[PDB]
Design a protein around this ligand. Structure first.
Ligand code: ALF
Ligand SMILES: [Mg+2]
Length: 893
């Protein structure tokens, strides 16, 4: 009954090699035979990730067709086509097709193609079976198999390491940092096994081996591992619906319910009085056509696409419309430190000498830009012997070479090379000829070279060593103070240890340097502080974002000290900020987690599950978080969040393909510009949505009043479709691209639970609809003769409705600002739209085939003057209301 239990990474880490092998029934030397691996694979399945399949585009088209409004429109179309009204039916189906095409384009998936996650997995693996090392695919691996790891070989599964010599594994897939973690074979205590990064005896799937060789026993395959859990979380997580999308859905369902109730009561009251079935069906089709605003989604999609292109011009790639729209009104921003805040380039910032001098080094990156200051004085070359000796020791004893701003070697060594180059000592290494080399190993933690001067070979040999302070100070016997060589005392070691501890508490990496004639008689020069500094201009941008309405959080993969130091540098750890680890996050209840999340801003040692839990807790109380990252765990976090902001030209492909916006030439001012553009687009969307809703309900209630008060249909489906789609479009697009005011880009972001329709907005909409209905009814009653539909009456009604809609759009162009301050032809797009609408109306009135199609007569100059003068009535009362509310605001101020 061979039944292997699932050995977690923690439990395997605690268990020594013998018990792990006994539980897994795995032979460390001879490996597994084919029968046992076949049976285990038959039980545990394959070591493969199933990406599954998506749904075809036609299913999405059908689902978009499944809207209740689309059913109502299709019912109206089928009723029209069943009544020998093929022209009206054709127009209705054309409008329906356009509407669903626009909706599908707007709601089209951004082509995630999330198979990049299943590519940081080796296709082959060097496994040992039946005492023979065989080249097999990783998909054939099973728990209990023995896998040999080499340099450049990607870890194919979770392995319990039992043999390892100087094994450094790149773990930038679960931690997200390119710091090779040393791997050991001894079991780990349960006290330090809280974090994944502390598991030095476990080789995780998807990680790359940088140096050394090792052999491990598989403890997990496929979906029962760390990478498997990450894949499960990514696959089972979908992008939440944006607050804009939720508001649009609520408005649509409310409109559908209202229209259904209205048409039901209209049918009931018509049947109570008694009407012909043909006329009842025609009236029902009329209200069905007038109930659905067809141009609103088209205008929304067009204006959002225009904003997306404008931000693309502003160096911001956008793939989906509503997600960036809700990002424009985001509340919380979470960003990774290693890959987004810091540029992932170790730089020396603090230098401490044996004499006791403290030196601060400016500049970021592997470039000569930057100065070394001591007591406020810039030191160049060999000006200060104390600092110069440390720089020389770090420079000659260095295997790293920096070419055209790209580092080849260890990042800490590159930091020393950059520090030397900033001081003008970039060519010092060529001046010395190395005779003996002692390398940097995880067992020794120190690097030394024996070199003699190139032009002064007859000078005695000088030895330079760098490494950890504890190991370096052993070989140190003397120290230099003010040019004099003094013997090392215990007090000197004490103060050096205190300085090292102080530097370590500030998130700096402590490296010791020493020099002397022979090993064991070396002289200690001092210590250097190496940290990952933030990018340039990042602090000012973060301050600008946090100044108005944004509370920026922080998720960090390093320990508490580095996160605290980075937050203090940015300003997120001033005096009272707290740091919470992932184990604490998973410890308390979700209610306590939601209580503790908003009052903290620093997170250290966070797994992908920890980031997902933090994002869910932030979104639980109601907020629009903006997660930012560049790693696989970061990518999972962005997938969990509604909006995903990635890092361009410096992040992984998985994060780029799993995000929403790609930030080439990574800036935060671009994020601010995107937020301002989103706010302006939301304001314009509200404006033209209000205009379209007012027009739609005005037409609906006008038709209802005409039906109740017993006149025939004034407008058919074709007239309403022509008004809504062809001519009401460009004005709404111009309103969508209306220039923004100085008060829109400012002010804290709005709460996400609000609705587009407000009390004042709906009151103005109702007033405008009532005015339009009264005008249209008066015109129809005046131009009606013996209950006979005259082509002149139809033309007058059409022109009056067109003019009223145009003037309503003009009045709804802006709120609480009138048209005098903004001025006519401010953007000239509204002027072009008005001119086009006027030309189209004139063509409809005068062109003979258009007259025959629309059943309209020819108008005179007097009729045009009458219709122009009567139309401006709504504008006067609109400006009166605007002045009234302006006066109310003035007296309230
Ligand atoms: F790069 Al990280 F948490 F520091 F994903
Ligand atoms: Mg990162």
């Amino acid at each position: 009954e061979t039944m292997i239990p699932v050995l977690t990474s923690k439990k395997a880490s605690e268990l020594p090699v013998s018990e792990v092998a006994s539980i897994l029934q795995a032979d460390l030397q001879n490996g597994l035979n084919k029968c046992e691996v076949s049976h285990r694979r038959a039980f545990h399945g394959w070591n493969e990730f199933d990406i599954s399949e998506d749904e075809p585009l036609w299913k999405k088209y059908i689902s978009q067709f499944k809207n209740p409004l689309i059913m109502l429109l299709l019912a109206s179309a089928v009723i029209s086509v069943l009544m020998h009204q093929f022209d009206d039916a054709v127009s209705i189906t054309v409008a329906i097709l356009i509407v669903v095409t626009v909706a599908f384009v707007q709601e089209y998936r951004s082509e995630k193609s999330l198979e990049e996650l299943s590519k940081l997995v080796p296709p082959e693996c060097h496994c040992v079976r039946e005492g023979k090392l065989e080249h097999t695919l990783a998909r054939d691996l099973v728990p209990g198999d023995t896998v040999c790891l080499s340099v450049g070989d990607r870890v194919p599964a979770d392995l319990r390491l039992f043999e390892a010599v100087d094994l450094s594994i790149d773990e930038s897939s679960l931690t997200g940092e390119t710091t090779p973690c040393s791997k050991v074979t001894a079991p780990q205590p349960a006290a330090t096994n809280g974090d994944l990064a502390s598991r030095s005896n476990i080789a995780f799937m998807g990680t790359l081996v940088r140096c050394g060789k090792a052999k491990g026993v598989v403890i997990g395959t496929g979906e029962n591992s760390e990478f498997g859990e990450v894949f499960k979380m990514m696959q089972a997580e979908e992008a939440p619906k944006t607050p804009l999308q939720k508001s649009m859905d609520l408005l649509g369902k409310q409109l559908s319910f209202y229209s259904f109730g209205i048409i039901g009561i209209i049918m009931l009251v018509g049947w109570l009085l008694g009407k012909d079935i043909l006329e009842m069906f025609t009236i029902s089709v009329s209200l069905a056509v007038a109930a659905i605003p067809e141009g609103l989604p088209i205008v929304v999609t067009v204006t959002l696409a225009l904003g997306v292109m404008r931000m693309v011009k502003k160096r911001a790639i956008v793939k989906k419309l509503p997600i960036v729209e809700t990002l424009g009104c985001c509340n919380v921003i979470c960003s990774d430190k290693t890959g987004t805040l810091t540029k992932n380039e170790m730089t020396v910032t603090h230098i401490f000498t044996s004499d006791g001098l403290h030196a601060e080094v400016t500049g970021v990156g592997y470039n000569q830009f930057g100065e070394v200051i001591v007591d406020g004085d810039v030191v160049h070359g060999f000006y200060n012997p104390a600092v110069s000796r440390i720089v020389e020791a770090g420079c000659v004893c260095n295997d790293a070479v920096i070419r055209n701003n790209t580092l080849m070697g260890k990042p800490t060594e590159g930091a020393l090379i950059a520090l030397a180059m900033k001081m003008g000592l970039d060519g010092l290494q060529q001046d010395y000829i190395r005779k003996a080399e002692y390398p940097f190993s995880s067992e020794q933690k120190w690097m030394a070279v024996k070199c003699v001067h190139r032009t002064q070979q007859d000078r005695p040999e000088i030895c330079f060593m760098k490494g950890a302070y504890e190991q370096v100070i052993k070989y140190c016997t003397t120290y230099q103070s003010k040019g004099q060589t003094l013997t090392l005392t215990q007090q000197q070691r004490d103060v050096y240890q205190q300085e090292k501890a102080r530097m370590g508490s500030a998130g700096l990496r402590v490296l010791a340097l020493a020099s002397g004639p022979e090993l064991g008689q070396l002289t200690f020069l001092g210590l250097v502080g190496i940290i990952d500094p933030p990018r340039t201009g990042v602090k000012e941008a973060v301050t600008t974002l946090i100044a108005s309405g944004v509370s920026i959080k922080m998720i960090t993969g390093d320990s508490q000290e580095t996160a605290v130091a980075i937050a203090s540098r940015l300003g997120l750890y001033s005096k009272t900020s707290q740091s919470v680890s992932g184990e604490e996050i998973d410890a308390m209840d979700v209610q306590q987690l939601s209580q503790i999340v908003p009052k903290v801003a620093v997170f250290y040692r966070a797994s992908p599950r920890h980031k997902m839990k933090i994002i869910k807790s932030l979104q639980k109380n109601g907020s629009v978080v903006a997660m930012t990252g560049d790693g696989v765990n970061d990518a999972v976090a962005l997938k969990a969040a509604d909006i995903g902001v990635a890092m361009g030209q410096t992040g992984t492909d998985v994060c780029k393909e799993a995000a929403d916006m790609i930030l080439v030439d990574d800036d935060f001012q671009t994020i601010m510009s995107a937020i301002e553009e989103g706010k302006g687009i939301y304001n314009n969307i509200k404006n033209f949505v209000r205009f379209q809703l007012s027009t739609s309900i005005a037409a609906l209630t006008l038709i209802s009043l005409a039906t109740l008060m017993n006149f025939p249909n004034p407008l058919n489906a074709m007239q309403i479709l022509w008004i809504n789609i062809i001519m009401d479009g460009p004005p709404a697009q111009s309103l969508g691209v209306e220039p923004v005011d100085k008060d829109v880009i400012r002010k804290p972001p709005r709460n996400w639970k609000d609705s587009i329709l407000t009390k004042n907005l709906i009151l103005k909409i109702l007033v405008s609809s009532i005015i339009i209905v009264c005008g249209t009814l008066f015109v129809f009653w005046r131009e009606l003769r013996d209950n006979v539909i005259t082509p002149r009456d139809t033309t007058m009604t059409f022109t009056c409705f067109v003019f009223f809609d145009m003037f309503n759009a003009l009045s709804s162009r802006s709120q609480t600002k009138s048209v005098f301050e903004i001025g006519l032809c401010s953007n000239r797009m509204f002027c072009y739209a008005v001119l086009g609408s006027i030309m189209g109306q004139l063509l409809v009135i005068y062109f003979p085939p258009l007259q025959k199609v629309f059943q309209t007569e020819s108008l005179s100059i007097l009729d045009l003057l009458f219709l122009l003068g009567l139309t401006s009535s709504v504008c006067i009362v609109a400006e009166i209301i605007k002045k009234v509310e302006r006066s109310r605001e003035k007296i309230q101020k």
